[PDB]
Structure formats: structure tokens, C-alpha cells
Ligand binder design. Structure first.
Ligand code: HEC
Ligand SMILES: O=C(O)c1cc(C(=O)O)c2c(n1)C(=O)C(=O)c1cc(C(=O)O)[nH]c1-2
Ligand SMILES: [Ca+2]
Length: 664
């Protein structure tokens, strides 16, 4: 009763609505709407906005259908907003335990919901796939898709194909076995499940593909460690070819030397899968990063399009994953058409067209010595949306340039109840502004070359939106909403959003008027690992749903200045070097993922260097006795001893004094 395949396909020509995550099943995030164009976007203004009781990352792409905006907020909460009145119609809160974040790698985020019939679908941080009544927001059915005992979580938006709700999950950083499932839209009954990596050999393979994949894995530890290959984000669908395309993630642990000692491609890690939606049977696959040992996922946006290659019309599938190569594949059979670097890439010389395999540079697998390379775990392109404009033939990518540093923990690797990369990710003590940069990259998929590029001081800028009005919209880490000419990248309109933006803009039509909406709420994993680059002006969270339209007259109020804060004058901290070092390591292994690398917090979670004296006195109570558990600060008594927590406190105070002396 409402949203069905015909309705979603129809939006391909009708720009009024946005019924699926990437707008259309092809996920081009291109709107035919052109009331707002390059000639008049200078007149664009804020039409209205909604303040949100949210203080964490907002990554959702809103959906618009029949006058209603459907979106989500941090902690997997869903809200329906009437686009005409601007009033919240209803909200659904799954009530995820705040401490669930201990096993949620990258901020308490949610990329959006899906629509089908008269229901709304959302995935939660604790592994649930829930169906809600579109009109009232009441829960219809709920499925616990993951083992509550394992470090799984759902952050991505589901898609609905032929009456089946498709959703994956995340957790490869902690160590889990990846998979994507299809649930019946009306009942929630599991239709089929495709695991992306093989499981315990002592048990049967769930499907034939796994038997073949198993031949590409070595050793007897990968299934105990999880294996990885989580499907936490992108997927596309072509109804004519009847193929569901899914992107799989990195391995668990990251380091193949520990994950699969003897080597191997480790299928289907970092791969693009073409699956039969009705059965879950694999039609074809393409492995983006064989033997992935760098957190190089292939879960980034998968866009379907029709391009003319060498004078011949081709049905392609495009992706610009973390590894830095831009892929153009024949979406009917998975044959590689082209693959070229779209930014700084030093881990591989190129992707061999004939074999389809990347030609790795010397020492990039860091077996004997640590390696500094590009891209990094943050990726040349992460989840921030890209978009395709059929008119210009260009793909607009939120490019990122950050150095990746990997160390082989090898025999010294120890599985912990925390991140298990086995690649020395814990060694990081900062993300310097000097070593990072970003850019709005207009990529030509046919020529495999940049058409134009707009530079940004840092990475972690928001997704893009393309429209028929020769425009591309994007929000930035620095706190602005932008509009550039699609063809040349000329800056046409800017707006101070009052919050760093990471989500993707979307547009729709209501009563003959075009609106552009964006979920403004600084967040995502980078804001948690922090570092200097993530503490520049504008990188603050002020969660709001912002809606723009021609001649919009709304104005955001000026924030109130922060109260007085007399920083404590740090007394010298004398301690044995090894003791401070022990604290440095323990902190990096267990606390950096939320409080920031080297204690340099990103602002969403407290800076341990600035804790009050009362807080410092209760350090043991907080860390080991869960005194702040109701606020989301986990208790680590299951992993750390009092003396170890003391070593961490010593390290923290050492950094506070170290930094305080920096100034003055
Ligand atoms: C994310 C899952 C976290 C990890 C891992 C660690 N901490 Fe944490 N911590 C987290 C939150 C969300 C908060 C804020 C709670 C609130 O609403 O105030 C905290 C807070 C603390 C504090 C108090 C800070 C202050 O108010 O000055 C301390 C002392 C603290 N956390 C310590 C700590 C240590 C030592 C950790 C590693 C073992 C650690 N945290 C991990 C979230 C998360
Ligand atoms: O390995 C995984 O399972 C997994 C899951 C997720 C997630 O669910 O958000 C992210 C990542 N990996 C990841 O590698 C990454 O860089 C990342 C960034 C973000 C974010 O929300 O900003 N999520 C994730
Ligand atoms: Ca990952």
C-alpha cells in the first residue's frame, strides 16, 4: 500500500520524491529537479530547520514521500517530519543501550531508513532490523539479525528489493563474520543470507560459494577471529538484470599475516558481489582488494549507469572504494572495464587490466617493517556519498588524503575486548592537520581522469548531491553547505550551517517548490579518533535538519559563548618511562577509539586531559566500576586491572602536562 518497485523506478524520471537511500536503485543520487539551478542558486536560502535532541554524528540521507520526510538520528532513532508544517509527526526510539558503543566502531550513527508499502525500515546499533508503520511510527516487526553476544552493529541504511529488506552489519574492527541478509518486508521472516567469508570447517558451508571461497584462506584461526567482510553500507539494484549488488568490507583482523598467515585472496573480503535477489545465489563477484590487510573496504557507494566506452554503450557499475582506485565494471558479468587511481595511492602501482588484480608495491604488507602508505583506514573515499550526473557524465567524490601507518603485531598479537586490527592501529597518537587534506573531486569515469577539483583543508567532508540544474551540493567538515556548478566546479552558494557536515544532501519537490535538505551533525569515526586535524574551527556538533529553498528567509540563531573555564595548572608528573609507556599503549588499545588518539579528543566525547579533579579522583570508579555507565562510558573491569588503569591515568596526566607546557 504505497512504495513498491514501480514507484521507486518511476522516480528515475520524476524528481519530486526520493524513495530509497541513494535516491534511485542505481544509487546515482541525481535529482531531475531543476527549479534551483546554476543561474539562480545564489538566491538559495534557509527555508526552515528543526533542532534535534542529538549530540552525536548524523549520517542519514532523508527520504521524501507523499509530503513526509523520513530520517534518523544518533542511536538509531527514527523520526517522520511533515514537510509542509515542519512539525515532527512521530519518532521511534529503539532504546539502544548507550554502552553498546563499546562494540560500535564508528560513532552511534545511522545512515537512514528505507520505505516499502506503508512501512519504514531501520537497522539498529544493537543488531535489530525493525519495521515501523509509516503513518504512526508504531513497530510492526523486529528481527535480531545478529548474535547479541558478538560485537556486531548496524549503521547502514537498508534497501528494499522485490519485497525483501536487505541489510548487513558492521564490526570487523572487533572481529566478526560478515554477511548480508534479505528479510520479508511484511513479516520480517528471513528469506536468505549470504555470508561473505567462510566459517568453522567443522560445520557445513551455508551455501556453495563458501566452499570455493575457503580455498583462498589459510590456517585455523580466521573463523575464530571472525574473518571480516562486513556489509555495512552500500548496495545497488538493477531490476532489468535482476541483480542485487553488494559491497563487502575489510578482514578481521586487518592484518592478513595474523588473519590468514599462509596468505590467500581471502574471498569475499573487499569485494563487489552481484547476487540474485530472489535466492541469494551469487551471479558474479569482483574482488577489489585481494588479501586486504589495510582496512580497505569495498562497502563504498556502488553506482549503476550507462556509459559509452570506446564507442560502445555499456551497462556499468562504478565504485571509488577506500583503496584509492576508481572502478568501472560491466555490471552484467562483472568484467573489469577500467581501474585508475583517483588520488594519492602508493600501496599499489596499478590494477592489472588483464588479471584484474592490483600490482602491489614492495613491502606494503608490512611483514618485516612497518609501512607508511596511502590511502589509510580512513580511506581515499569512505561512506560519505558520491553522486553521478548523467548530464555532465561526472562522478562527484568526497576525496580524502590521509597517511596510513601499519605495523605487523604478528606473533605478539593478542585478541582483546576492543579493536583487534593486529596492525598497530593503537600506535597512532595524532592526525596532524599538516598531513591531511580533502577535496570535492569531479571524476570522469570514461576518461578515468579528474574534470575539476575543489580543495579542502582536511578530509571528512560530507556526501554530494547532483541535480539537473547543473549543480552539485555538499556540506563540509569546516561547517558550510555548498553549491557548485556541475560542469566546472565554480563556487555558487555558501551557507554557515553551525555544524560540521558528514551526511549527504537530498532534494525533493513539495507543492511545486524544490527543497534541498541536509542532516547537519558532525560525527563519524574520524571525530572520535580525533587528532589536531579534527579540531579545526567549525568541527563541532550542533545537530539540525536544515532545509533550503529559493529565497528562503530563515536564520539560525547565534550560539551562546561557552561558560568560563579556568584550565588547571598541571603539576609535573614524575614516573618511570616504562610506566608512562604502558599507559600510552593501554590507552591506545582501549580508550583512543572514543577519547581520541593521543588523548586528543574530537569534541563529541570528553577530553581526558581536561577532566576535573573530582573526576580524576574517581578514575578507578568510572573506568572499572562503571560509575558513568548510564551515560555510555563502559566499565572495563573485564579487560583491565586497577594498576593498568592507573598506568593509563598516568599517561593521560602526562599528556595534559606535556600539552600545557606547549603553550606558555
Ligand atoms: C566509547 C565506547 C568509549 C570508550 C572506549 C571509553 N570511553 Fe570513557 N567515556 C565515554 C563517554 C561517552 C563518556 C562521557 C559520559 C558523559 O555523558 O559524561 C566518557 C567519559 C569518561 C571519563 C569522564 C570524563 C570527564 O567527564 O572528564 C573518564 C575518566 C573516562 N571516560 C575514561 C576512560 C578510559 C580510561 C577509557 C579506556 C579504558 C575509556 N574511557 C574508554 C566513552 C568511552
Ligand atoms: O569494518 C566494519 O565492519 C566497519 C563498519 C563501519 C560502520 O558500521 O559504521 C565503519 C567501518 N568499518 C570503517 O572501516 C570506517 O572507516 C567507518 C567510518 C564510519 C562512519 O560512520 O564515519 N563507519 C565506518
Ligand atoms: Ca572497518
Amino acid at each position: 500500500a504505497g512504495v513498491d518497485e514501480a514507484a521507486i523506478r518511476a522516480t528515475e524520471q520524476a524528481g519530486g520524491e526520493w524513495l530509497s537511500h541513494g535516491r534511485t536503485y542505481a544509487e546515482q543520487r541525481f535529482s531531475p529537479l531543476k527549479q534551483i539551478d546554476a543561474s539562480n542558486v545564489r538566491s538559495l536560502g534557509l527555508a526552515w530547520y528543526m533542532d534535534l535532541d542529538n549530540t552525536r554524528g548524523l549520517e542519514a540521507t532523508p527520504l521524501f514521500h507523499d509530503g513526509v520526510i523520513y530520517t534518523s538520528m544518533s542511536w538509531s532513532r527514527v523520526i517522520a517530519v511533515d514537510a509542509a508544517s515542519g512539525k515532527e509527526l512521530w519518532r521511534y526510539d529503539p532504546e539502544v543501550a548507550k554502552v553498546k558503543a563499546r562494540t560500535s566502531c564508528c560513532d552511534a550513527v545511522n545512515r537512514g531508513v528505507a520505505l516499502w508499502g506503508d512501512k519504514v525500515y531501520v537497522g539498529t546499533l544493537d543488531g535489530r532490523l525493525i519495521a515501523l508503520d509509516a503513518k504512526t511510527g508504531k513497530a510492526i516487526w523486529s528481527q535480531q539479525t545478529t548474535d547479541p553476544a558478538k560485537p556486531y552493529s548496524i549503521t547502514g541504511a537498508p534497501r528494499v528489493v522485490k519485497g525483501k529488506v536487505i541489510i548487513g552489519n558492521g564490526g570487523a574492527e572487533y572481529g566478526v563474520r560478515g554477511f548480508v541478509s534479505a528479510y520479508d518486508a511484511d513479516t520480517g521472516k528471513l528469506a536468505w543470507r549470504f555470508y561473505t567469508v567462510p566459517g568453522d570447517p567443522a560445520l557445513p558451508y551455508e551455501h556453495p560459494e563458501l566452499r570455493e571461497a575457503a580455498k583462498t584462506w589459510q590456517g585455523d584461526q580466521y573463523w575464530k577471529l571472525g574473518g571480516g567482510g562486513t556489509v555495512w553500507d552500500s548496495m545497488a539494484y538493477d531490476p532489468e538484470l535482476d541483480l542485487l549488488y553488494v559491497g563487502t568490507g575489510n578482514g578481521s583482523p586487518w592484518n592478513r599475516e595474523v588473519r590468514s598467515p599462509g596468505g590467500g585472496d581471502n574471498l569475499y573480503l573487499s569485494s563487489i558481489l552481484a547476487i540474485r535477489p530472489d535466492t541469494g545465489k551469487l551471479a558474479w563477484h569482483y574482488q577489489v582488494t585481494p588479501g586486504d590487510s589495510w582496512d580497505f573496504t569495498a562497502t563504498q557507494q556502488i553506482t549503476l549507469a550507462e556509459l559509452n566506452i570506446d564507442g560502445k554503450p555499456r551497462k556499468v557499475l562504478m565504485q571509488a572504494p577506500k583503496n584509492g582506485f576508481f572502478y568501472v565494471l560491466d555490471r552484467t558479468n562483472g568484467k573489469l572495464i577500467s581501474a585508475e587511481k583517483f588520488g594519492k595511492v602508493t600501496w599499489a602501482e596499478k590494477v592489472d587490466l588483464a588479471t584484474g588484480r592490483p600490482v602491489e608495491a614492495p613491502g606494503v604488507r608490512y611483514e618485516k617493517e612497518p609501512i607508511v602508505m596511502w590511502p589509510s583506514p580512513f580511506g581515499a573515499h569512505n561512506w560519505h556519498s558520491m553522486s553521478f550526473n548523467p548530464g555532465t557524465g561526472l562522478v562527484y567524490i568526497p576525496y580524502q588524503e590521509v597517511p596510513g601507518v601499519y605495523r605487523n603485531e604478528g606473533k605478539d598479537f593478542v585478541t582483546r575486548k576492543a579493536f583487534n586490527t593486529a596492525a598497530g592501529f593503537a600506535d597512532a597518537t595524532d592526525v596532524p592537520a599538516a598531513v591531511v587534506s580533502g577535496a570535492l573531486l569531479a571524476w570522469d569515469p570514461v576518461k578515468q581522469k579528474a574534470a575539476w577539483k575543489v580543495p579542502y583543508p582536511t578530509h571528512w567532508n560530507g556526501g554530494t548531491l547532483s541535480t539537473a540544474g547543473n549543480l552539485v551540493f555538499q556540506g563540509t567538515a569546516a561547517g558550510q553547505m555548498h553549491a557548485y556548478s556541475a560542469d566546472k566546479g565554480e563556487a555558487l552558494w555558501q551557507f554557515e550551517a553551525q555544524s560540521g557536515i558528514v551526511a549527504a544532501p537530498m532534494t525533493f519537490e513539495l507543492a511545486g517548490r524544490q527543497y534541498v535538505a541536509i542532516m547537519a551533525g558532525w560525527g563519524g569515526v574520524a571525530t572520535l579518533t580525533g587528532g589536531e586535524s579534527m579540531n579545526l574551527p567549525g568541527m563541532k556538533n550542533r545537530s539540525r535538519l536544515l532545509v533550503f529553498a529559493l529565497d528562503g528567509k530563515a536564520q539560525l540563531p547565534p550560539p551562546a559563548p561557552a561558560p568560563a573555564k579556568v584550565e588547571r595548572v598541571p603539576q609535573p608528573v614524575t614516573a618511570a618511562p616504562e610506566q608512562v609507556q604502558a599507559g600510552k599503549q593501554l590507552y591506545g588499545q582501549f580508550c583512543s577509539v572514543c577519547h581520541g588518539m593521543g588523548t586528543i579528543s574530537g569534541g563529541l566525547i570528553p577530553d581526558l586531559r581536561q577532566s576535573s579533579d573530582a573526576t580524576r579522583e574517581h578514575f578507578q570508579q568510572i573506568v572499572l566500576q562503571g560509575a558513568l555507565k548510564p551515560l555510555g562510558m563502559p566499565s572495563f573491569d573485564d579487560s583491565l586491572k586497577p594498576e593498568e588503569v592507573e598506568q593509563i591515568k598516568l599517561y593521560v596526566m602526562s599528556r595534559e602536562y606535556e600539552d600545557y607546557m606547549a603553550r606558555h
